[PDB]
Amino acid sequence: TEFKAGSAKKGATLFKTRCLQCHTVEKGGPHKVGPNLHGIFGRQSGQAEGYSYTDANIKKNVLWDENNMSEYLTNPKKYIPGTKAAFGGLKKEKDRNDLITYLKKASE
Numbered sequence: 001t002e003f004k005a006g007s008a009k010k011g012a013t014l015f016k017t018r019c020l021q022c023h024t025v026e027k028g029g030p031h032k033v034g035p036n037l038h039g040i041f042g043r044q045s046g047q048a049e050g051y052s053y054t055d056a057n058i059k060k061n062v063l064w065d066e067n068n069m070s071e072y073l074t075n076p077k078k079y080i081p082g083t084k085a086a087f088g089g090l091k092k093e094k095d096r097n098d099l100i101t102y103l104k105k106a107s108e
C-alpha cells in the first residue's frame with residue numbers, strides 16, 4: 001500500500017464520533033444505516049450481501065484502498081452516483097489521516 005499510517009488511536013475517537021453513527025467496524029457487524037467496514041481494505045466495493053445495496057456501488061466497483069476511500073469520504077454521493085449515504089462529506093482532511101489509519105488497522 002502507498003499510504004503510511006498516522007495513529008491507530010485517535011482515529012478510533014474520530015470513527016466513534018463520525019462513522020460509528022451509521023456503520024460498524026466489528027466482524028460481520030450490524031449493517032445499521034451503512035454496511036459494516038471489516039476487511040474492506042483490499043476487498044472491492046459491495047462485499048456484504050443481504051443488506052440494502054445499490055446498482056451504482058456495484059457498477060462503481062472500487063477496490064477500497066486508502067486513496068479511493070479518502071476521496072469517496074470527501075463526496076460519497078458524487079463518487080458513487082447512487083448511495084443512501086447522506087453523510088456530511090469529510091472536509092477536515094487532517095483527522096481523515098488518523099481515521100483512515102484506525103480503519104486500515106481495524107480492517108487488517
Ligand code: HEM
Nearest residue numbers: 018019021022033034045046047054057083084085086087
Ligand atoms: C467518516 C465516517 C465514515 C466512513 C469512514 C464511511 C465509510 C464508508 C465506506 C467505505 C462505504 C462503502 C461500502 C462498500 O462499498 O462496501 C460506505 C458506504 C455507506 N455509508 Fe459510510 N462512512 C462514514 C460515515 C457515514 C455516515 C455517518 C453515514 C450515515 C448518515 C453513512 C452511511 C453509509 C451508507 C448508507 C453506505 C452505503 C452506500 C452504498 O454502498 O450505496 N456513512 N461508507
Ligand SMILES: [C-]#N
Nearest residue numbers: 073076085087
Ligand atoms: C459513507 N459515506
